[PDB]
Design a protein around this ligand. Sequence first.
Ligand SMILES: COC(=O)/C=C/C(=O)OC
Ligand SMILES: COC(=O)/C=C/C(=O)OC
Ligand SMILES: COC(=O)/C=C/C(=O)OC
Length: 295
Amino acid sequence: RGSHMVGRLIYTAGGYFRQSLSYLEAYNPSNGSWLRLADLQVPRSGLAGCVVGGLLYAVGGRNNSPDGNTDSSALDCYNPMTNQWSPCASMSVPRNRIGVGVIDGHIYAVGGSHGCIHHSSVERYEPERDEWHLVAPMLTRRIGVGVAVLNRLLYAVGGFDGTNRLNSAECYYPERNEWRMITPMNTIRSGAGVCVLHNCIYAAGGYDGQDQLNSVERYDVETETWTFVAPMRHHRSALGITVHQGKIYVLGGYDGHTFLDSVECYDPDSDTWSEVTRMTSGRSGVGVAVTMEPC
Ligand SMILES: COC(=O)/C=C/C(=O)OC
Ligand SMILES: COC(=O)/C=C/C(=O)OC
Ligand SMILES: COC(=O)/C=C/C(=O)OC
């Protein structure tokens, strides 16, 4: 898979170490290299990343800084061809510890917190019109929620509702604008990395109310059951996650002791995790997505 005429990189945006971060860095699995690119205009942790039409989007989060703490409603777009960030229309509400998924070229922003309240609301961005619109809210308030898309359906997995961390999960059916509960995970997880590989939704890591997790489980949408696979080498919560050429990559996080620079890669063929690189510095709460090499 080469986009146009160049390779695809794993982009990590933002994050947290002592304070919220503005870093944008790109990792190349083909040769091991890291590139530092244009900083975010506003530092942010607890954001999500996604790609539509080759462009990288940074959604939500919070600027934890000495000068103050501000939850973000921002949507910002990075163009690899220009190495520049551009503001887009802002969401209806600030959303820290947000989850994001893409269906049919549209960005869904799910859940997250604003101050002391925990959202169940969901809204959808149309890049063609630069507009957000609210859709049906989830059945559950969720922050630290993992999101993934499979077969043009949107899934919201785990999180924290303001009192309890959650093992529950739910699915959104766009043509009925309706959420439905699915089978709950076997583990309570907030701040897990959630992605899709083949016909399964993976939930890696997270926080269960006492411990950061290294376990990984996957939901087979045909069987409606969750099964554990190999655990990661590191326990981690608030990790970044993405898929690149058939493998899962997890980036950073917090293990109860250190903000991790470790990047691990899961090979589904062998059911093994391996360390593949280190980020340039340890951090948690990053947004991650995959698109073309920059100029
Ligand atoms: C923005 O993300 C955070 O502030 C998380 C910090 C943490 O759990 O490390 C002790
Ligand atoms: C052009 O509209 C699209 O749906 C493109 C999506 C994309 O770039 O996949 C990572
Ligand atoms: C309020 O409870 C916590 O300490 C949360 C820890 C966490 O999110 O994992 C690193």
